[PDB]
Amino acid sequence: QPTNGVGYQPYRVVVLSFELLHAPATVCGPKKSTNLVKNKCVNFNFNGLT
Amino acid sequence: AYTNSFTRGVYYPDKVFRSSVLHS
Ligand SMILES: *[C@@H]1O[C@H](CO)[C@@H](O)[C@H](O)[C@H]1NC(C)=O
Structure with missing residues (x-):
């Protein structure tokens, strides 16, 4: 129901x-x-592998 | 009916390159 208590709402x-x-x-x-x-010599990142 | 497997049926367990290593 649109007026169920929040714990019973969808x-x-x-x-x-x-x-x-x-x-x-x-x-x-x-x-x-x-x-x-x-x-x-470098800082690097491949696909999120820093 | 049957026969023996010997040492068939091992496979690469993970998608990683490793070399010259006795991994477990
Ligand atoms: C496995 O096969 C051998 C013959 O190659 C036989 O002697 C043995 O009893 C068999 N064991 C099982 C559990 O099938």
Whole structure:
């Protein structure tokens, strides 16, 4: 009912499960690639592996 | 009816490169 007590009202649910494997990433945030660098000391990040 | 498996049926357990190692 629209006038049930809140503990007896309907609720919608979503549950997100994240597949954090060493397989290839396919769902990623608004992050942006640089050019690659070689043979020099650098800070790096690959798919979230800092 | 049957036969023996010997050492068939081992598989790469995880999606990671490892080399020259006696992993467990
Ligand atoms: C397994 O196979 C051998 C013959 O290759 C037989 O002697 C033995 O009894 C068998 N054991 C089982 C549990 O099937």
